[model samples]
Target: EPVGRLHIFSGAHGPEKDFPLHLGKNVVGRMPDCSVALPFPSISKQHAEIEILAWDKAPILRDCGSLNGTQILKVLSPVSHRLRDQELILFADLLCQYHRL
Candidate 1:
């Protein structure tokens, strides 16, 4: 299935710089339609979130928040906020199964 939505973080350099990065395309050339880049300030507290509603047998997506210097999804709860790189891979595998190239 095609991706329903695309989220991107464009900071500083304005729309020109931000849109290209979000779509994973070269900004030097034409733009693509499969993108929606928004301008947001880059303060230390700045962050982005993509909420994936549960579908089929997929697990319910949670906040999975992060900070200025941490992985995109911290494994532990907010109070514990521990980083678990390997553990997160398990979730990645599950997602990969759903989208199976």
Candidate 2:
């Protein structure tokens, strides 16, 4: 079960971009269709995803077939993985860190 909210902090853009996670699937990218719009060249139209489990609130991260792909600080993928606190989520040139809040 999740202890608290998940926060994402990204510093690759004009200002340090950041936000808190919510329930359901969050689509992140440089495009306008994303739940959280990144609006950068390095990010894909559909860069990545974070799913908040309904029962446990345990978040999962996945790469949405992005050209540049997604990277966690330790995990490797085109695969989905459970997210933990204070890990980096990188896609294209954007670098973001996750936190339990």
Candidate 3:
């Protein structure tokens, strides 16, 4: 199966939640329609998308031109990035982990 995982770290004062990402687009943000929904204020409504097109290859994460931004290993990403296994990404300040499973 073409699936991925997200380990979310919602700051020091928030809760921790993990999510499953399937093939195609898995969106995350503060919106109701996204695949992973975080209620944090800093996260945009349609923050980003975690895309898994195949099982043998790595997944890709693309930002939705948000107000805050996306960061990989604490560095801000310009647009899109290919996610590696055990890589950590940030949606605004909400920390998240990407894993190929």
Candidate 3 matches the true fold with a TM-score of: 0.86
Candidate 3: which stretches are off by over 4 Å?
Answer: 10-14, 74-78
For every model shown, the clashing-pair count is 0, 0, 0
1-101: candidate 3 lDDT, tens digit per residue: 43888988755766777788988999888977888887778999988888888888788788888899988884555456888899988888777788777
lDDT of 2 by residue, 1-101 (tens): 23334344535345565665667888888878787787878788888888876645557888888888787765446677888777777777577776665
What's the lDDT for all of these models? 0.23, 0.71, 0.81
How many steric overlaps does candidate 3 have? Answer: 0
Top of the candidates by TM-score: 3
Better of 1 and 2 by TM-score: 2
Top-down lDDT ranking: 3, 2, 1
Judging by lDDT, tell me the better candidate of 1 and 3.
Answer: 3
In terms of lDDT, model 3 sits at 0.81
Off by over 4 Å in 2: 1-12
Model 1 poorest ten-residue lDDT run: 92-101
lDDT of 1 by residue, 1-101 (tens): 32222222232443322121121221111122222222223212222222233222222222224232223224423232222211231121111011201
